[model samples]
Target: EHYIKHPLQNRWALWFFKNDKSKTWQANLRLISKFDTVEDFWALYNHIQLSSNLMPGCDYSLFKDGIEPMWEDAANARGGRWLITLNKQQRRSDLDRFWLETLLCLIGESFDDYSDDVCGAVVNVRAKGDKIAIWTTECENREAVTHIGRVYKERLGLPPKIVIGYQSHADTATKTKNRFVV
Candidate 1:
């Protein structure tokens, strides 16, 4: 006898980037796995170390099946990200929870109509502070971008007083200020 797997709305991929200062950025980036069902996602998630457990300078990226987790990727060329910065202390207190919630939001298609606008999310573990960002396909689509940001912020259960910022890839590359805040 066989069983059916619950299919997700969109297939997704998980990528791991272990920062090695001696190696080129591309060299350290690895494709962990790809999955299109709830069961597979859980299987991968369970087997991997939690974001908080990753060494500083490592990162985890979960994106729609075809999109590479790089600004140069076609889907990300014109896109931006909604960024959530966590202080050093919050790493132990909130990192894993926030990351898992971010992944759930992506795989669950929790953004309503704007869900399609999302390309993926990245959680970067750093010595100074950890950061999480949801990358969207069109930074100029104020409606979709802002809606996704609002929904994501709520989904993460962030306090109203805690604000998050959105910055286009171009701006980010050029080191510009955030274009939107939610």
Candidate 2:
């Protein structure tokens, strides 16, 4: 027998970026595709290479429909992201799993009531250290941002010893002071 697939409340867009020194930053950023359902999400996840598998200096960003995962995006301008820095060793040992779980949390609406505050998530593959982030709409909304970070951390199965910091996009773009750390 055939079965119907589950649906998410909101549609999301998945972006793939490769940093090329020869190209402009905007040129380096590319929109891969967008999807809204559970089945489509899995299909995309299965088809695309894992973040850890991407060459160094690349990134995967999954954001809500209509919101670009960048500082210029109005929805993300005042927002911040919970940052997790992983050592090079963790890329093979934990990066792929962590990135997958990060995607799951975003698509699964794991934030409960505060899911609206969540903008998206990104995984950066860097030579020195790989990183993952869960972005939020407003850094000033301390309760929501911190709660999201806490839940996100738990979902990633991160240890209590591992701390994640939340930095505003404004700060990240301007290279100024960071807003919150959880």
Candidate 3:
């Protein structure tokens, strides 16, 4: 009777942020929608503007339902992100694909049990380059963190030669050297 054909394991929230010079940073962010089924996910995704066409300083964030896309969110306060940066040349080709795949990975629990440790994923559109990252709740979970990074890389169909790095919230905020690469 309803449109939902497949139920997902977790509800996901999508947030949009655009850098508006006239507004405060938080003022520019808006929560888009929440979906717990594949059908609805596609509906939401299709209705929105494509990531490739976003303003130079815009961003799209998909996080587990209730986990706001911010460093201060309780769910993300102790977390960190596994990041992959793409050059300007690849933005036209890889940005959207990479972001969509990252979304699929989280919704499908591609990391299996380790996916629970994941808080969300973010994609940033910038003048320098486009970037994507998956955030995990606890950087101290070495096994979970490393496994997610490894399986996530493969799930994104990234080449074995390509590299990604993980940086903790603390280190990122303090600008220290603690990071793990896969």
Clashing pairs in 2: none
TM-score of each: 0.95, 0.92, 0.93
Candidate 3 C-alpha lDDT tens digits along 1-182: 56538999999999999887756456898889999999999999999988889889989999998887888889888889999899998898888888899998999898877889999999999999998999999988999999999998887788978888999987888864546889
Summarize candidate 2's per-residue lDDT along 1-182 as a digit string, tens digits: 16877888889999988887756467898888888889999898899897777899899999999897786788888888898889988998989998888888888888878999989989999999998988899989988987898898888887878777888887887754556655
lDDT of 2: 0.86
Q: TM-score of the candidate numbered 1?
A: 0.95
lDDT of 2 at 180: 64
- Local distance difference test, candidate 3: 0.89
Which residue runs of candidate 2 sit more than 4 Å off their true CA positions?
22-26, 176-178
Q: Per-residue lDDT for 15 in model 1?
A: 95
Clashes of each: 0, 0, 0
Query: Positional deviation of 1 in candidate 1, in angstroms?
Result: 11
- Candidate 1 regions exceeding 4 Å error are 21-25
Overall local distance difference test of candidate 1: 0.92
